[PDB]
Design a protein around this nucleic acid. Structure first.
Lengths: 158, 56, 157, 173, 56, 53
RNA sequence: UUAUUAUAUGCACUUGUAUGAUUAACAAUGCGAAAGAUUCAGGAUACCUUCGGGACCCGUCUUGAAACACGGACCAAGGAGU
RNA sequence: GCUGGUUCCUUCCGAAGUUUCCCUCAGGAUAGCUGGUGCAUUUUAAUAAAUAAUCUUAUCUGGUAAAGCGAAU
RNA sequence: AGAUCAAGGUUAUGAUAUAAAUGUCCCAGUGGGCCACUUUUGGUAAGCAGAACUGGCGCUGUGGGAUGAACCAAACGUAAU
RNA sequence: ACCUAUACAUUACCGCUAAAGUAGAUGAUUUAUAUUACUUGUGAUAUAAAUUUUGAAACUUUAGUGAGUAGGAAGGUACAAU
């Protein structure tokens, strides 16, 4: 009859997944985050002074706090419906980077350079993003082994 | 073996009502401007509209 | 092989004739070498002189509506949908008797005992020859089994 | 449909780690030229890895049975699935063409076994010459010549006059 | 800029209002399922022309 | 779909049409067809067709 | 070279093509007849007469009333948002 | 906080049956939905290089099937 | 981190926008619900209860399984085809 | 091959929502004609004729569009006395 309160429902979430227990790495005690370096909020089991509570874990956010050994985030969570902002304070080793910006920054500097090579011939930019297309119309020699090549099933009886 | 070209330029005509429609197929279908029965528009095909076209 | 069938049955336009577009006969003839022209026989029944008789069978009835602005007919000559399409576009007229006169004979003579609403058939409906039909007013409702008529007007060949 | 015949080859799109994929082929009898295009995937998903869309369907080819005027009979192997007794199966039906020899075979398999079309895979079609048909309801027709006064009609019943006058007296000998 | 597909296409069919196709006489054959078992809606892609000769 | 006549003409059961084209003229059916006394009755599709006015 | 097309038709006129939700020449049928008054369509105005389908008999609380759920015999005047 | 009745016509729009709190559990406040009242403005408002919503592209996110006992428990 | 100069393509995924954008009255109501598919506890169970995610019924006529608030077609200005 | 829905389409029509147009009429406007400046030919003058009104809360025109109790605002009518 309960959630209500403060750490219930942490079966596979809040601990350490397999073969990573014990002493923390020291890479994540080194990282640096400016204002606007978009970052994630996730779970941990090796700094037991601080957590993001039962709903947040698995969400990412902006950073507008720079402090002693903490990070204060903006994050969106579902109320019904007034989806608000929330300011959560947390010690740093709960937190991983976004890599979702980390494709986009090399989407920038290619476009500053591929326009820069375009600045000698003019046409054309072609600088937006497009997924795969309907391709072509080949003609295909066998070339490699003419047809039939006939796999027809018969397998049930066992 | 000469393949034909697999094509762009589809054309999409609604078939079924306004009602008894699935949850997130209500926003996709207002996102092609098919609303009434037997209305149609065209698309520019790629993968990025197939998995909009598949969810209707 | 079927290319002469794009040719040989234009001999009806050569036996009518108009511009004579075929020399091979297709004659339905009594000759042993003349075994063609392919009639979709049989039927042999007239119902076509004038007021060719066709009794009436209720409105274009839904199961649970009416749509009484139209009406549906039973055309006693016809029995397949190639028959009845010759009853496109004819009028449809039905007489039924009543008491008084109340009108002088001026457009061509009428002592006025007969009274008749009017109309016009359109299209073939039933896969055997029942052919629905619209009237001037509405087919007065008690006629389902009255002997209404179809006159030849207008007609062609 | 009348179950026309298509042969069909798949592609497995040409990914650079191994270009020129081996392009396997089926033999599909199908109600339509539009529907074998997504039946070939059902046969192909029994053997290779190959899922749509990681492969293309290079040319379906309608093939035009060669000897229609002759009356050559065929056997078909068969995989029916009834209620739970999915099996192997061998039959034959004596037909004119191969394309008529699969409509009839469906519409016997749906006729005595109920065997819907979602449980039949035409695994093989062989042109049997003679002398190996087991099939007692067929090979009694091998016996040319035959007297055969099985006098039938359409029994068009009867015809036009729904109140006739002339007593329709079938046998007429 | 539609039948040949080009780079002005995206503005070349928001320019059309959706049509008002009538209803295809002969009918719809079943309207039950996807094309490749029963037959109607879906990946039909080539027999759309026998529809639009009727439906429009 | 068909009714039968009464004139059996010999052929091999795997005959091409050309010997049937040969033998049908040899079996003089086209002579004796229109003399069959109730294929005189066949002439109501060959004369009583359309029975002009 | 061979095909091809539009541009090189002003001047008045014409019941005249098409254009402003592109329907209209003809023909018949008839006198708004001093007052009087025939003709053609319409017309359940609210009946009665004749047939085809429809169809539970009205408030209301409730998920649900045709209710084998409560209130209603009929009518005129009075009555509840100040 | 419980039942009965709460009287003229059309046009427009069109819900609730939930969370909390309460000697409340047949009721009320509360947000919720709705309706009204305008008001500020987009080359997304008047003779796009800016937005807000679904898929794509990319990037993180969970232990439920399916498994798994020739690992723990 | 801030203010301020210097260089800068066509603004950077698709498809739309029946128009988007907000402050009051806290505005009348309503705070008892029902069902089918999957997913599913309680119980042997039921046209019972107890729910999460949708669609619908209450608010809704309707054409169709004679019948039936939900079933499946389709969501209802007056008219002919 | 046919079968029927108040659904789908097209023509009318109703109301509703949206968009858009119209006010120097002691003018505007054609139709003719006299003349003319004459610029071949386009314009101004003069005569003759006729069309030209609305609670701009009007009027024209255009597209789309219409279910509904619980409930809120919209103009409309009865029965009053001042």
């Amino acid at each position: 009859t309960n959630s209500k309160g403060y750490r219930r429902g942490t079966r596979d979430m809040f601990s350490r997944p397999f073969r990573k227990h014990g002493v923390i790495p020291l890479s994540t005690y080194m990282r640096v985050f400016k204002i606007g370096d978009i970052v994630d909020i996730k779970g941990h089991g090796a700094v037991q002074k601080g957590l993001p509570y039962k709903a947040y874990h698995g969400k990412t956010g902006r950073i507008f706090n720079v402090t002693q050994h903490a990070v204060g985030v903006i994050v969106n969570k579902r109320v019904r419906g007034k989806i608000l902002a929330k300011r959560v304070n947390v010690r740093i080793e709960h937190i991983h980077h976004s890599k979702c910006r980390e494709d986009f920054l090399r989407r920038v500097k290619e476009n500053e350079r591929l326009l820069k090579e375009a600045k000698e011939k003019g046409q054309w930019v072609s600088l937006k993003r497009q997924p795969e297309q309907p391709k072509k119309a080949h003609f295909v020699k066998k070339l490699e082994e003419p047809i039939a090549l006939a796999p027809i099933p018969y397998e049930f009886i066992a | 073996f000469y393949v034909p070209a697999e094509a762009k330029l589809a054309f999409v005509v609604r078939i079924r009502g306004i009602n008894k429609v699935a949850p997130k197929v209500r926003k996709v279908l207002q996102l092609f401007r098919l609303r009434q029965i037997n209305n149609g528009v065209f698309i520019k095909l790629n993968k990025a509209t197939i998995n909009m076209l598949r969810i209707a | 092989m079927a290319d002469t069938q794009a040719k040989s049955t234009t001999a009806p336009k050569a036996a009518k004739a108009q511009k004579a577009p075929k020399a091979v006969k297709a004659p339905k003839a009594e000759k042993p070498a003349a075994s063609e022209a392919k009639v979709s026989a049989k039927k042999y029944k007239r119902h076509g002189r004038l007021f060719a008789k066709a009794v009436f069978t209720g409105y274009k009835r839904g199961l649970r509506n009416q749509h009484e602005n139209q009406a549906i007919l039973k055309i006693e000559g016809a029995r397949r949908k190639e028959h009845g399409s010759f009853y496109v576009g004819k009028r449809c007229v039905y007489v039924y008797k009543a008491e008084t006169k109340k009108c002088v004979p001026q457009h061509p003579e009428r002592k006025t005992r007969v009274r008749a609403v009017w109309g016009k058939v359109t299209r073939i409906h039933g896969n055997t020859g029942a052919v629905r039909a619209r009237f001037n007013r509405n087919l007065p409702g008690h006629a389902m089994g009255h002997r209404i008529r179809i006159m030849l007007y207008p007609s062609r060949i | 449909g009348l179950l026309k015949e298509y042969e069909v080859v798949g592609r497995k799109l040409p990914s650079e780690k191994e270009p020129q994929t081996p392009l396997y082929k089926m033999r599909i009898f199908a109600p339509d030229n539009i529907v074998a295009k997504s039946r070939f995937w059902y046969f192909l998903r029994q053997l290779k890895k190959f899922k749509k869309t990681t492969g293309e369907i290079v040319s379906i080819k309608q093939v035009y049975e060669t000897s229609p005027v002759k009356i050559k009979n065929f056997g078909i192997w068969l995989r029916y699935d009834s209620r739970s007794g999915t099996h192997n199966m061998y039959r034959e039906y004596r037909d004119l063409t191969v394309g008529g020899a699969v409509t009839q075979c469906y519409r016997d398999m749906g006729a005595r076994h109920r065997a819907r079309a979602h449980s039949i895979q035409i695994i093989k079609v062989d042109s049997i010459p003679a002398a190996k048909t087991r099939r007692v309801h067929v090979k009694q027709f091998h016996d040319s010549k035959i007297k055969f006064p099985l006098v039938q009609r359409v029994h068009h019943k009867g015809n036009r006059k729904l109140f006739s006058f002339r007593k329709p007296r079938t046998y007429f000998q | 800029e539609i039948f040949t597909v080009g780079p002005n296409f995206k503005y070349a069919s928001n320019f059309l209002w959706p049509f008002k196709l009538n209803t295809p006489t002969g009918g719809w054959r079943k309207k039950a399922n996807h094309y490749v078992n029963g037959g109607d809606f879906g990946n039909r892609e080539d027999q759309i022309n026998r529809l639009l000769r009727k439906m429009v | 779909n068909l009714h039968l006549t009464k004139y059996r003409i010999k052929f091999p059961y795997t005959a091409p049409t050309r010997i049937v084209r040969k033998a049908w003229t040899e079996s003089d059916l086209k002579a004796q067809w229109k003399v069959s006394p109730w294929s005189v009755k066949a002439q109501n599709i060959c004369k009583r067709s359309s029975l002009n006015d």
